[PDB]
Amino acid sequence: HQNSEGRGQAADLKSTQAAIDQINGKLNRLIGKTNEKFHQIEKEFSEVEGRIQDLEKYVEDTKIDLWSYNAELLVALENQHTIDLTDSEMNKLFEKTKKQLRENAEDMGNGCFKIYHKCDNACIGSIRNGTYDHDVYRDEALNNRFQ
């Protein structure tokens, strides 16, 4: 923010934590998923056996392909969701702020609000902490809006 009292910036733990909470946890679906597999068929061969070896190769091969595709699709999906998740959590933060300001400001379009009254660092905290009552500054702000 930039008001008459000067400049400054501070984080919002409430929404940021909601982003980490969904990532750390989406990992827990993927990190420890490993499942045991004991004594499968031999995927490697020394001599040439013909029909049986052709099948034993065709099995372990076609298994690998399907899992590789399944893997690629899973990453590309969890990525597209991870990108969309993070964007939404801040895009929510913008709306949560806008609904708080009521008529006392305007969307500049640069991802910033132009608050149309004298705001100290005190009122900035009431926005951040979430206690901003628009009704007091409403009369004060509306006159600045129209000129």
Partner: protein, 46 residues
């Protein structure tokens, strides 16, 4: 800024040297940080 106004911006995190990942839309997109899901290496002993 005029002492009768006030300017409030909100934004998100960013980092200098990030990493490229693949999604549905695009093959390249830079994210803040990421981990590799394929164990490409191993130890030399059993």
């Amino acid at each position: 800024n005029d002492n009768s106004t006030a300017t409030l911006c909100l934004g998100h995190h960013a980092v200098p040297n990030g990493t490229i990942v693949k999604t549905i839309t695009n093959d390249r997109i830079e994210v803040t940080n990421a981990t590799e899901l394929v164990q490409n290496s191993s130890i030399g002993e059993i």
